């Protein structure tokens, strides 16, 4: 590296989140820290930002062939299923931090729920979808005890 950084000013630069290239003796240079800029608990982490950025771009590219179809009920259950079989495959490969229940997606497209009659006339659809991403594990704390 050009300038050698140490741990006592790592403490200052890891808030106001900017990352750092570190040097270690045994393994050489390594990148360090994976925090984005603005620091509310919405998105402070690179992968939680980049997971929602890639899940939108794949479903938005394939809904583009069906963009002028009628707004009946058999179209609703065909879209809600093709989104259901996309998050389920992504859940069972360890990317949505949900437990052994189903609670990682609630995609719903109905008319009584999530819509009503008067925005059908100004032709719309509403896809309420939501995930539960996984956070990286830093600051591992041991806390040994006697018993």
């Amino acid at each position: 590296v050009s300038v050698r950084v140490t741990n006592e000013q790592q403490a200052e630069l890891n808030p106001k989140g900017i990352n750092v290239i570190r040097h270690f003796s045994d393994r050489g240079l390594v990148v360090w820290g994976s925090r984005t800029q603005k620091d509310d608990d919405d998105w402070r982490y690179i992968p939680v930002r980049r997971l929602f950025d890639a899940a939108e771009r794949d479903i938005k590219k394939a809904l583009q062939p069906m963009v002028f179809e009628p707004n009946s009920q058999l179209t609703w259950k065909r879209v809600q299923t093709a989104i259901d079989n996309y998050l389920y495959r992504l859940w069972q490969q360890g990317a949505l931090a949900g437990n052994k229940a189903e609670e990682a997606y609630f995609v719903r497209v109905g008319k009584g729920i999530t819509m009503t009659q008067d925005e059908i006339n100004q032709g719309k659809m509403i896809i309420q979808v939501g995930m539960a991403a996984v956070r990286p594990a830093e600051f591992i704390i041991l806390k040994f005890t006697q018993d």
Binding site: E8, Q9, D40, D41, D42, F52, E56, K60, L63, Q64, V67, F68
Partner: protein, 348 residues
């Protein structure tokens, strides 16, 4: 907007929030303005022992050199060093000061201490004692009017002597006992029985000279026992009122709000509505519940230990909502040290 046909997408508006814990120990020290063997720079920032040695290559005998060498030797961290004319500026800027100790300065330090209390910066200083040898014949009070009465601070008399070198002012000895306390077990426990190392007190006080200086004010002597040695003894603040004694119950309320006030700065100018009131109420008590299991504040059925309330007619009625105000109130019962232990025998 919905100008052209195609596929639009929106995301969530607001997310959750919570408070971050603490720092609990960042002191600024008491430089002397007339001192010569030093830099004319008023404000210095020292982070650990490394740059302190390259700045000060020779071992000196002054009260500040013997104070920082006792801070770093018991652990320690990021500590400042300001002259005794610029406390009122350095506290209002650096946003993390907790302790104002006195490294052998009394006269002009007590004015600058009570200045930043007057604006309500929520700080906790700690002072020096008298110089040497209260004779103990009489006069329990006349050594105690030169100290500003406030629920912030203690005095720590006996003037440990640091048998390696010259004397050490006891604000450094008291500040070293807090450092190995909050790192070990919390801030709600008093810097009371954790021992210091390498410092011997110059005097042997008594068992009963502690007794007549335990009421009214809070001499808080430094006394050496058999087995454990040179330990501090007594954690009492300057008043005797049943709300504000017991230095750890002051620092508990002092550090339970500097993390809420730091976090709520990104929640101002938010709409004063119903989904706000049920979100702050559900975010504060999730921090207190993490603090109740750790033994900081005592009580079963943890609805009894604290309470949080926010609403529309229990507080902040309709007219002061139209002025923009959003007032809350929370109240909690902390723990107190078991300073006196009495035990009764019987026959049954």
């Amino acid at each position: 907007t919905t100008t052209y046909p195609g596929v639009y997408l929106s995301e969530d508006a607001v997310s959750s929030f919570s408070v971050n814990s603490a720092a609990t120990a960042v002191p600024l020290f008491a430089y002397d303005s007339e001192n010569t063997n030093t830099i004319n720079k008023p404000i210095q920032v020292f982070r650990n022992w490394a740059e302190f040695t390259v700045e000060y290559p020779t071992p000196l005998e002054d009260a500040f050199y013997t104070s920082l060498s006792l801070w770093f030797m018991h652990g320690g961290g990021k500590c400042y060093l300001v002259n005794e004319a610029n406390i009122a500026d350095a506290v209002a800027q650096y946003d993390d000061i907790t302790l104002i100790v006195a490294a052998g300065t009394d006269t002009t330090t007590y004015t600058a201490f009570t200045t930043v209390v007057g604006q309500g910066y929520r700080i906790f200083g700690l002072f020096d004692g008298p110089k040497e040898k209260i004779a103990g014949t009489a006069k329990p009070d006349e050594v105690m009017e030169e100290y500003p009465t406030s629920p912030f601070g203690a005095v720590f008399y006996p003037w440990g002597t640091l048998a390696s070198g010259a004397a050490v002012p006891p604000s450094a000895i008291a500040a070293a006992s807090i450092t190995q306390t909050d790192r070990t077990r919390g801030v709600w426990k008093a810097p009371a029985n954790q021992a210091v190392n390498g410092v011997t007190p110059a005097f042997a006080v008594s068992d009963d000279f502690q007794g007549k200086y335990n009421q009214g004010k809070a001499l808080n002597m430094i006394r050496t026992f058999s087995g454990q040695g040179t330990v501090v003894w007594g954690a009492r603040t300057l008043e005797d009122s049943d709300n504000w004694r017991y230095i750890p119950v002051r620092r508990l309320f002092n550090a339970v709000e500097r993390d809420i006030q730091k976090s709520l700065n990104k929640l101002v100018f938010e709409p004063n509505s119903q989904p706000t009131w049920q979100r702050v109420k559900a975010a504060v008590d999730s921090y207190l519940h993490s603090l109740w299991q750790q033994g900081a504040l005592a009580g079963n059925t943890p609805a009894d230990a604290w309470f949080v309330q926010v609403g529309k007619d229990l507080t902040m009625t309709q007219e002061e909502i139209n002025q923009g105000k959003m007032i809350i109130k929370i109240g909690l019962a902390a723990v107190r040290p078991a300073e006196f232990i009495i035990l009764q025998f019987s026959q049954d």
